[PDB]
Design a protein around this motif. Sequence first.
Motif, PDB file in Angstrom:
ATOM      1  N   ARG A  87       0.806  -1.238   0.000  1.00 39.83           N
ATOM      2  CA  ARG A  87       0.000   0.000   0.000  1.00 39.83           C
ATOM      3  C   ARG A  87       0.831   1.276   0.000  1.00 39.83           C
ATOM      4  O   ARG A  87       0.468   2.238  -0.684  1.00 39.83           O
ATOM      5  CB  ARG A  87      -0.965   0.027   1.198  1.00 39.83           C
ATOM      6  CG  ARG A  87      -1.974  -1.099   1.260  1.00 39.83           C
ATOM      7  CD  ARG A  87      -3.225  -0.635   1.974  1.00 39.83           C
ATOM      8  NE  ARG A  87      -3.135  -0.741   3.433  1.00 39.83           N
ATOM      9  CZ  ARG A  87      -3.697   0.116   4.285  1.00 39.83           C
ATOM     10  NH1 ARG A  87      -4.379   1.166   3.832  1.00 39.83           N
ATOM     11  NH2 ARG A  87      -3.565  -0.055   5.592  1.00 39.83           N
ATOM     12  N   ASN A 175      -3.825   7.991   1.284  1.00 36.14           N
ATOM     13  CA  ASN A 175      -4.736   7.104   0.557  1.00 36.14           C
ATOM     14  C   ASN A 175      -4.795   7.462  -0.945  1.00 36.14           C
ATOM     15  O   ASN A 175      -5.301   8.528  -1.305  1.00 36.14           O
ATOM     16  CB  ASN A 175      -6.125   7.123   1.212  1.00 36.14           C
ATOM     17  CG  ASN A 175      -7.100   6.115   0.660  1.00 36.14           C
ATOM     18  OD1 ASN A 175      -7.562   6.215  -0.483  1.00 36.14           O
ATOM     19  ND2 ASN A 175      -7.487   5.159   1.490  1.00 36.14           N
ATOM     20  N   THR A 200      -2.586  -5.709  -4.546  1.00 35.03           N
ATOM     21  CA  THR A 200      -2.315  -4.874  -3.363  1.00 35.03           C
ATOM     22  C   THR A 200      -3.408  -5.199  -2.296  1.00 35.03           C
ATOM     23  O   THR A 200      -3.084  -5.404  -1.125  1.00 35.03           O
ATOM     24  CB  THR A 200      -2.245  -3.395  -3.754  1.00 35.03           C
ATOM     25  OG1 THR A 200      -1.146  -3.207  -4.644  1.00 35.03           O
ATOM     26  CG2 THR A 200      -2.109  -2.462  -2.540  1.00 35.03           C
ATOM     27  N   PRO A 418     -11.398  -0.563  -3.159  1.00 37.51           N
ATOM     28  CA  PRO A 418     -10.660  -1.520  -2.332  1.00 37.51           C
ATOM     29  C   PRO A 418     -10.928  -1.390  -0.844  1.00 37.51           C
ATOM     30  O   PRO A 418     -10.857  -2.407  -0.130  1.00 37.51           O
ATOM     31  CB  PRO A 418      -9.197  -1.243  -2.687  1.00 37.51           C
ATOM     32  CG  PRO A 418      -9.198   0.188  -3.146  1.00 37.51           C
ATOM     33  CD  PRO A 418     -10.461   0.303  -3.917  1.00 37.51           C
ATOM     34  N   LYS A 419     -11.263  -0.161  -0.378  1.00 33.99           N
ATOM     35  CA  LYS A 419     -11.521   0.053   1.044  1.00 33.99           C
ATOM     36  C   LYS A 419     -12.821  -0.630   1.452  1.00 33.99           C
ATOM     37  O   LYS A 419     -12.900  -1.175   2.542  1.00 33.99           O
ATOM     38  CB  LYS A 419     -11.519   1.536   1.433  1.00 33.99           C
ATOM     39  CG  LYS A 419     -11.571   1.756   2.949  1.00 33.99           C
ATOM     40  CD  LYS A 419     -11.959   3.168   3.299  1.00 33.99           C
ATOM     41  CE  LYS A 419     -12.385   3.303   4.737  1.00 33.99           C
ATOM     42  NZ  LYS A 419     -13.210   4.528   4.940  1.00 33.99           N
ATOM     43  N   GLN A 422     -12.249  -4.612   1.398  1.00 33.57           N
ATOM     44  CA  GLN A 422     -11.566  -4.976   2.651  1.00 33.57           C
ATOM     45  C   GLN A 422     -12.511  -5.011   3.870  1.00 33.57           C
ATOM     46  O   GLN A 422     -12.369  -5.877   4.727  1.00 33.57           O
ATOM     47  CB  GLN A 422     -10.374  -4.005   2.913  1.00 33.57           C
ATOM     48  CG  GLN A 422      -9.355  -4.427   4.005  1.00 33.57           C
ATOM     49  CD  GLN A 422      -8.659  -5.743   3.804  1.00 33.57           C
ATOM     50  OE1 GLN A 422      -8.859  -6.478   2.823  1.00 33.57           O
ATOM     51  NE2 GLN A 422      -7.826  -6.085   4.763  1.00 33.57           N
TER      52      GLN A 422
HETATM   53  O1  LIG Z   1      -7.049  -1.917   4.374  1.00 35.62           O
HETATM   54  C1  LIG Z   1      -7.427  -0.750   4.208  1.00 35.62           C
HETATM   55  C2  LIG Z   1      -7.933   0.085   5.341  1.00 35.62           C
HETATM   56  C3  LIG Z   1      -8.108  -0.530   6.738  1.00 35.62           C
HETATM   57  C4  LIG Z   1      -9.343  -1.408   6.897  1.00 35.62           C
HETATM   58  C5  LIG Z   1      -9.270  -2.575   7.714  1.00 35.62           C
HETATM   59  C6  LIG Z   1     -10.413  -3.401   7.880  1.00 35.62           C
HETATM   60  C7  LIG Z   1     -11.629  -3.064   7.229  1.00 35.62           C
HETATM   61  C8  LIG Z   1     -11.716  -1.900   6.412  1.00 35.62           C
HETATM   62  C9  LIG Z   1     -10.573  -1.070   6.245  1.00 35.62           C
HETATM   63  C10 LIG Z   1      -8.308   1.372   5.078  1.00 35.62           C
HETATM   64  O2  LIG Z   1      -8.836   2.271   5.933  1.00 35.62           O
HETATM   65  N1  LIG Z   1      -8.229   1.942   3.822  1.00 35.62           N
HETATM   66  C11 LIG Z   1      -7.769   1.232   2.847  1.00 35.62           C
HETATM   67  S1  LIG Z   1      -7.538   1.768   1.150  1.00 35.62           S
HETATM   68  C12 LIG Z   1      -6.901   0.247   0.669  1.00 35.62           C
HETATM   69  C13 LIG Z   1      -6.470  -0.012  -0.646  1.00 35.62           C
HETATM   70  C14 LIG Z   1      -6.000  -1.308  -0.953  1.00 35.62           C
HETATM   71 CL1  LIG Z   1      -5.439  -1.609  -2.562  1.00 35.62          CL
HETATM   72  C15 LIG Z   1      -5.921  -2.291   0.069  1.00 35.62           C
HETATM   73  C16 LIG Z   1      -6.355  -1.997   1.396  1.00 35.62           C
HETATM   74  C17 LIG Z   1      -6.853  -0.691   1.716  1.00 35.62           C
HETATM   75  N2  LIG Z   1      -7.350  -0.128   2.971  1.00 35.62           N
END
Ligand SMILES: O=c1c(Cc2ccccc2)c(O)nc2sc3cc(Cl)ccc3n12
Length: 448
Positions: A87, A175, A200, A418-419, A422
Amino acid sequence: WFHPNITGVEAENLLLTRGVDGSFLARPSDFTLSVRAVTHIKIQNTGDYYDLYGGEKFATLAELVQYYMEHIELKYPLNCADPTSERWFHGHLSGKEAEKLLTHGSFLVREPGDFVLSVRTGDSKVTHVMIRCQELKYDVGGGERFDSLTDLVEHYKKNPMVETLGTVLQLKQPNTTRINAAIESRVRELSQGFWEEFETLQQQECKLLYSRKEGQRQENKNKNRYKNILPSDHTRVVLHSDYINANIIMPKSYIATQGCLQNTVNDFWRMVFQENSRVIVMTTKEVERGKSKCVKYWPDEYALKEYGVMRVRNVKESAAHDYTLRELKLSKVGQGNTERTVWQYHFRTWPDHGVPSDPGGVLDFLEEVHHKQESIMDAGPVVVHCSAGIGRTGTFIVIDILIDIIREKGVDCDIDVPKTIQMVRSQRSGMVQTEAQYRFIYMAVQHY
Ligand SMILES: O=c1c(Cc2ccccc2)c(O)nc2sc3cc(Cl)ccc3n12
């Protein structure tokens, strides 16, 4: 153990020189499990799960590796040094661009052969730390030398750098994906860029905190359509005997579930009733490529069937191009006043492999589902199922969540695909299975 930009020969030499027996890696080829003599084991994922040749089906590559390391021996993971899937890694970028982008605890590593750790500090300033690379190892000018930029970052995430005048250079968060609605430009830039961003996200699988205990129980194995694809225990549906391979998804709520088995039909209707769900989204055919994906848990049109203590009536069926809509009526056997309509939107035009060429049809379907859900007072979560309840189910819930935002805020809202994925994966592992689906979510949000 995952290496994103290697070949079969590069892997073979790596395992022979930098490895021993029981040593293994994984790489894109479709994936290959290279174990050490060096053997290459194929992993296929057309959109439902990871199917290992002469093995089993899994939600994630990490679940696959965790299973074979616990039960051709997978013993020593041969760690990767390339930071492309991390990331924080930006690659080509200048100081000014990194300064402007960073404008607390927010960091990045950018790119002769040397790297630069740019960190924000405040309540503010941007601190740039040089990373020298000498004979393959990395360092901040003194002390320990690291095998990869990953080992360096994680060492300084735990042990922050102290500036001369007492400034703590905390490595908190990386971000670069939260685009404003506008999407067209981002889709052009990611057109691959999508695969890079997808892996990623994949590299963030093991960061998620979850247990799979209840699904691994003796009394619950028969209730799983795929023994290794199990629900997360913190978000699972508890039936008030209590087990179903289903999870509640809360960003409108959804229940992500697998296609019904003959022995789980009654538990599926117990869940719909208990949860006060009035909308079911079936994103699979009952049979695809001669294999059963979901058993018929609904009666024939005009028919009435008892499913344990639940009674279901099929009132009317309405065919559209991409889908069928069944008006179902659910009540508990014994008490008449417990009745409610359950609408089942059965999408039938999803390809056996991959994703639709145009998302128009999926977008018409979800629009109808959304208005039917919003028309019902006190309605429970929208039940969403495919085969395993992770691939198609995941693509449908993610597209639905993102368009839910664009419906309530308009062309002026900040979305991060992606957020969102996840966050859904934190509630059921494997949600959104392939890169093709991932790209389809972007194309769907674009077409919307
Ligand atoms: O992982 C996260 C988390 C943290 C998170 C943890 C648990 C549940 C939701 C969020 C977060 O705020 N924002 C982002 S943006 C992003 C982009 C990509 Cl390629 C991969 C990840 C990722 N990612």
